[model samples]
Target chain A: VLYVGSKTKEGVVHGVTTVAEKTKEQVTNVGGAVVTGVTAVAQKTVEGAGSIAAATGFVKK
Target chain B: VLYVGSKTKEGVVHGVTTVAEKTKEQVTNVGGAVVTGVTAVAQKTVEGAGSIAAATGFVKK
Candidate 1:
């Protein structure tokens, strides 16, 4: 594995979360592009992004 | 916005998919960390990672 200095585990997790959340948003484009809804996805677990985005509607089911 | 020069949309989506899928694996640490299961994740939609990982159980709910 590669190493980064001075980054907290929390920070790494945060960065990853942002990527995942952004992916969530990007994928939504499929919905508008004639692709069917992504169901039973089981993002499984990760928070703020999923729970929060759902409320706003960009993170649709 | 940033520019990547010569990448296809499919490639961009592939890269994002890899990141999101890795996040799914990393987050599974929670299950082993005494953290509770992530439910109704609404990963909603994405593939191979969610559906496939679930078969392995690391992507559990």
Candidate 2:
């Protein structure tokens, strides 16, 4: 028969495992948002630079 | 010539991007540790249960 102490320990460990999984998932979501925001800003920067270069005839056809 | 404001903005964005990347890396490392710890605990629990069962003649040969 499984001891009561062992069963209690298993329950606690299981709870910890579940919490860890959720933490990982939340962190991944935050990372995805960061990537998306950075990409958007980078793209805008490149586009703005191109616009300025074109306006000032800085680029040759 | 690129405006000073634009240059500053680019630098700020780069800094934020770098910080975000580092945060993601740290979170991933934490997640890895959590998984490793939980796995170790789980394995021990299973082994302990097996030993207990064997000692109590709960298992058939």
Candidate 3:
């Protein structure tokens, strides 16, 4: 699977995998997280300040 | 599990999993909704907009 988000230094997985951190920040910034069912697929961006930063890795079955 | 777009026939479910339908009109004006981080491995070319659509089938575990 892929994990997309931001790149910040305060998380266990510093890059896009830092979704939880970004999500918290997003909630704070947006006054609230506006949508529901943010499937794990919904992640932050790396292309912008709060854009999608992706972790293009894989998981083996 | 893949969702791509377009097929000459409407509501046909023809080429791949329909990720909703293209609801705008214009002869070849087929379009609507954009997305992010589509995972479920494709080929050498990273799948993104304006690219060829390819899909293989899958089932639940």
Candidate 4:
């Protein structure tokens, strides 16, 4: 039950990490958005879900 | 054996998708870099790895 989930979790982590790097790489724009607004909220949502998934399995009981 | 991995795969897909949205959300800048360059390569790498992961499990053979 445990080992099987291992590889899957690795992919989840890898994919999310890639996503973050993408954000930083592309968003090199200065914070001129005066409306950076709810945008940050959505990005954070992504991470929060990632966290939930990670804890659901694979990191040891 | 199979059902166990279902949730983890969900996370992987969710995270990667979130990452893409972030890229589009932030990179609303006009293309003036003259060198959007190798930067794009990395973002694609992120997605490719994601593809590998999705196939490794979850979405079925």
Instruction: Output the number of the TM-score-best candidate.
Output: 4
Q: Which candidate do you rate higher for TM-score, 1 or 3?
A: 3
Candidate 3 chain B, run of 10 with poorest lDDT: B6-15
Model 4, which residues run further than 4 Å from truth? A4-6, A10-61, B1-8, B13-61
Name every residue pair that clashes in candidate 1: A38-B44
Residue A5 error for model 3, in Å?
38
Q: Write model 2 residue lDDT over B14-36, tens digit each, in one string.
A: 22221212222323322111111
lDDT of 3 at A20: 24
lDDT tens digits, residues B1-61, model 1?
3333433121011111223342222121222212212222223233332223222122122
Q: For candidate 4, lDDT tens digit of each residue in A1-61?
A: 2454443432222322333344334444432221221110111112221222111101111
Judging by lDDT, tell me the better candidate of 2 and 4.
4
Task: Give the alpha carbon lDDT tens digit for every residue of B1-61 in model 4.
Answer: 4444344432223333333334433444332211221111011112221222111111111
Per residue, candidate 3 scores C-alpha lDDT tens digits across B1-61 of 2224322121111122224222332221112121222233212223344322222211111
Give the range where candidate 2 chain A is weakest over 10 consecutive residues by summed lDDT. A52-61
Worst 10 residues of 4 chain A by lDDT: A37-46
Candidate 1 error regions (>4 Å): A1-61, B1-31, B37-40, B49-61
lDDT of 3 by residue, A22-53 (tens): 21111111111122111122221123232212
**Which residue pairs collide, candidate 4?**
none
Q: List each candidate's DockQ score.
A: 0.05, 0.02, 0.03, 0.10
Instruction: Identify the superior model by DockQ, candidate 2 or candidate 4.
Output: 4
